[PDB]
């Protein structure tokens, strides 16, 4: 009888994982502070990694990679890409970004800025960490000064879906098990904007920001073209064939897989638990932008991602098979893509 503990009540993913675990008869849930566990579904912040792997005769597994925040914090991700030789400041799939405090990059940012608005080139940036999209650098730095922020080049030539003339982002779910296998969930989701893309008005951010948060509280056409502003790969793939005579695999998914591999391989020496007294796995939420040339851009990496209501059953079961049962067996067909 395997034992596990739940230390994040808010996780919709591992709430389902805990539900599936109990529905096998071979897993028992213990109190949050019981140290004699096999599996910890740990808290998001300040997870006590230092107390894992010290119980006599217990192989202990945790659903977070200590040190993965370097990839999942907007500020640190920029620093990692510019610093890591595996990625370098020449990395072609990450938008030009700068870390600005209210060791600082506020100076270099203004240098490359002058080179843009001076050369007639599109010079729109987005500061984030409370989002702002401005045309001149003046209004941008004032927003941050008035927590650390990151100024990033705004993709002014996004791929707009038709009908609608609307932007979107792609979410890919990636599971990394204790052996540091990189698994890409075969089902992604497009979080689309219900409003037409406006190239001049950056004040209204309902058609520029595609996250499900804004596409509901402020979306005027929520659910018109697709239920819940969520288009899945099958529909999107059929669209790319009809509209552009290409496939999702060729035009986009190849770049997505390359970007996932590059980011996770880069940090493997720092977070791998191969020779560690405990083991880790983690689910990641990668967010991508596609431009009108069918080039894929990495936006951010989420370390505690939610899932599409329609995909919880498959992904959560897949987590139990690949991440949990692989270490703690029970008494093919595969939903992931091994990278």
């Amino acid at each position: 009888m395997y034992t596990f503990v739940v230390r994040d009540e808010n996780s919709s993913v591992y709430a389902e994982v805990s539900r599936l675990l109990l529905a096998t008869g071979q897993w028992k849930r213990l109190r949050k502070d019981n140290p004699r566990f096999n599996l910890m579904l740990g808290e998001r912040n300040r997870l006590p990694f230092g107390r894992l792997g010290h119980e006599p005769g217990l192989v202990q597994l945790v659903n977070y990679y200590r040190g993965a925040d370097k990839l999942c914090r907007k500020a640190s991700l920029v620093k990692l890409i510019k610093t890591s030789p595996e990625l370098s400041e020449s990395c072609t799939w990450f938008p030009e970004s700068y870390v600005i405090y209210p060791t600082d990059e506020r100076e270099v940012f203004l240098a490359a800025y002058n080179r843009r608005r001076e050369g007639r080139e599109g010079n729109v940036w987005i500061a984030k960490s409370g989002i702002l999209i401005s045309s001149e650098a003046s209004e941008l730095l004032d927003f941050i000064d008035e927590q650390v922020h990151v100024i990033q080049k705004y993709l002014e030539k996004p791929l707009l879906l038709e009908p609608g003339h609307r932007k979107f982002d792609i979410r890919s779910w990636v599971l990394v098990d204790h052996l540091y296998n990189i698994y890409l969930y075969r089902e992604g989701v497009l979080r689309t904007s219900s409003e037409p893309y406006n190239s001049a008005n950056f004040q209204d951010k309902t058609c520029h920001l595609t996250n499900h948060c804004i596409q509901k509280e402020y979306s005027k056409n929520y659910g018109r073209y697709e239920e819940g502003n969520e288009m899945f790969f099958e529909e999107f793939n059929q669209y790319l064939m009809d509209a552009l005579n290409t496939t999702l695999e060729n035009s986009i998914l190849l770049q997505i897989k390359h970007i996932i591999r590059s980011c996770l391989m880069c940090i493997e020496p720092a977070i791998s638990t191969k020779h560690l007294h405990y083991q880790s796995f983690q689910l990641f939420g990668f967010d991508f932008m596609v431009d009108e040339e069918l080039k894929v851009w990495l936006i951010e990496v989420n370390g505690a991602p939610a899932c599409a209501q329609k995909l919880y059953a498959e992904l959560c079961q897949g987590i139990v098979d690949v991440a949990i049962s692989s270490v703690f067996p029970l008494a093919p067909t595969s939903i992931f893509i091994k990278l």
């Binding site: 990694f49 230092g50 792997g53 010290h54 200590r66 040190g67 977070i271 560690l276």
Partner: peptide
């Protein structure tokens, strides 16, 4: 001599 992770 003491199990811990110097990488962090």
């Amino acid at each position: 001599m003491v199990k811990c992770d110097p990488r962090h």
